[PDB]
Amino acid sequence: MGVQVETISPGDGRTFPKRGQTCVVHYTGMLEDGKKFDSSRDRNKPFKFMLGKQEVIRGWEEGVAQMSVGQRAKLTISPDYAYGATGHPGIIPPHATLVFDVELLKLE
Amino acid sequence: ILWHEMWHEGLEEASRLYFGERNVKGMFEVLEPLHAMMERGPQTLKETSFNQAYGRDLMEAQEWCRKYMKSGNVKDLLQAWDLYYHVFRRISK
Numbered sequence: 404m405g406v407q408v409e410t411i412s413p414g415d416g417r418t419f420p421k422r423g424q425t426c427v428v429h430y431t432g433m434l435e436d437g438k439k440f441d442s443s444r445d446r447n448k449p450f451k452f453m454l455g456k457q458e459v460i461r462g463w464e465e466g467v468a469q470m471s472v473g474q475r476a477k478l479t480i481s482p483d484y485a486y487g488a489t490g491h492p493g494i495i496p497p498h499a500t501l502v503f504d505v506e507l508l509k510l511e
Numbered sequence: 512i513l514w515h516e517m518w519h520e521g522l523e524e525a526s527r528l529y530f531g532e533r534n535v536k537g538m539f540e541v542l543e544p545l546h547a548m549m550e551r552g553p554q555t556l557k558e559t560s561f562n563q564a565y566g567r568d569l570m571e572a573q574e575w576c577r578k579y580m581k582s583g584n585v586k587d588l589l590q591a592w593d594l595y596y597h598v599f600r601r602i603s604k
């Protein structure tokens with residue numbers, strides 16, 4: 404639908420993010436063609452965020468919530484679950500399907 | 512009112528205007544007064560303490576904003592928000 408999750412390597416299949424829990428992830432963001440626009444791995448600093456706060460796009464909110472600790476997954480996010488018709492001028496084109504390589508390192 | 516709370520509220524609102532509503536002018540409207548407040552210099556010990564802690568980071572974020580205003584290159588604006596995000600996390604209790 405809006406976000407498809409395909410496992411690259413498995414987690415414990417038991418430790419899923421709760422409410423008020425901080426997800427710690429490494430991500431690589433690419434356009435559908437496969438052109439990289441961002442990576443936390445380029446900065447050697449994991450990205451931290453809290454689920455259910457609308458801090459991140461809907462695809463991450465619903466995608467990362469399905470992942471268990473240790474899991475590396477590919478998220479294919481349709482425009483309506485990403486930056487939609489508007490996109491982000493000079494970053495994300497209009498109507499862009501985004502592919503994120505996401506690794507859920509731990510929860511805090 | 513404490514400089515860290517004014518910067519917390521301003522950076523949060525500015526990020527909402529730019530990333531939420533694709534409104535760079537609105538973002539700049541929120542940031543300019545806070546940068547001006549810094550430029551007037553610290554008055555209290557807590558304001559002096561804040562300026563010493565995060566003065567450098569906030570100055571480099573403004574520099575990237577000025578570079579963006581000339582270039583029109585969003586990459587320069589994302590560099591500024593990388594520093595603003597860094598400051599936001601450090602200052603936020």
Ligand SMILES: CO[C@H]1C[C@@H]2CC[C@@H](C)[C@@](O)(O2)C(=O)C(=O)N2CCCC[C@H]2C(=O)O[C@H]([C@H](C)C[C@@H]2CC[C@@H](O)[C@H](OC)C2)CC(=O)[C@H](C)/C=C(\C)[C@@H](O)[C@@H](OC)C(=O)[C@H](C)C[C@H](C)/C=C/C=C/C=C/1C
Nearest residue numbers: 432441457458459460522523526530531589592593596599
């Ligand atoms: C410099 O680089 C940017 C990130 C870039 C922007 C461009 C995109 C291609 C991208 O490269 O990230 C990217 O990889 C991406 O698409 N991301 C980032 C990784 C998570 C998934 C996705 C995303 O949702 O980003 C986010 C997306 C771009 C915008 C948001 C999408 C959800 C929507 O509900 C929000 O409405 C407001 C806006 C960016 C973020 O993850 C950052 C952390 C969070 C926010 C800005 C908002 O949650 C904001 O709301 C007030 C906050 O609470 C913040 C913490 C307040 C403080 C002061 C501001 C911090 C700002 C940090 C900015 C950073 C590091």
Ligand SMILES: [Cl-]
Nearest residue numbers: 427449451508
């Ligand atoms: Cl960490």
Ligand SMILES: [Cl-]
Nearest residue numbers: 424425510511
């Ligand atoms: Cl925890």
Ligand SMILES: [Cl-]
Nearest residue numbers: 519520523603
């Ligand atoms: Cl808050």
Ligand SMILES: [Cl-]
Nearest residue numbers: 519602603604
């Ligand atoms: Cl705070």
Ligand SMILES: [Zn+2]
Nearest residue numbers: 452453456458
């Ligand atoms: Zn947060």
Ligand SMILES: [Zn+2]
Nearest residue numbers: 424425510511
């Ligand atoms: Zn914890």
Ligand SMILES: [Zn+2]
Nearest residue numbers: 427451509511
């Ligand atoms: Zn940590």
Ligand SMILES: [Zn+2]
Nearest residue numbers: 513514515561
């Ligand atoms: Zn303070």
Ligand SMILES: [Zn+2]
Nearest residue numbers: 519520523524
């Ligand atoms: Zn706040």
Ligand SMILES: [Zn+2]
Nearest residue numbers: 568597598601
């Ligand atoms: Zn710093």
Ligand SMILES: [Zn+2]
Nearest residue numbers: 570571574575
């Ligand atoms: Zn500089």
Ligand SMILES: [Zn+2]
Nearest residue numbers: 596597598600
């Ligand atoms: Zn930082």
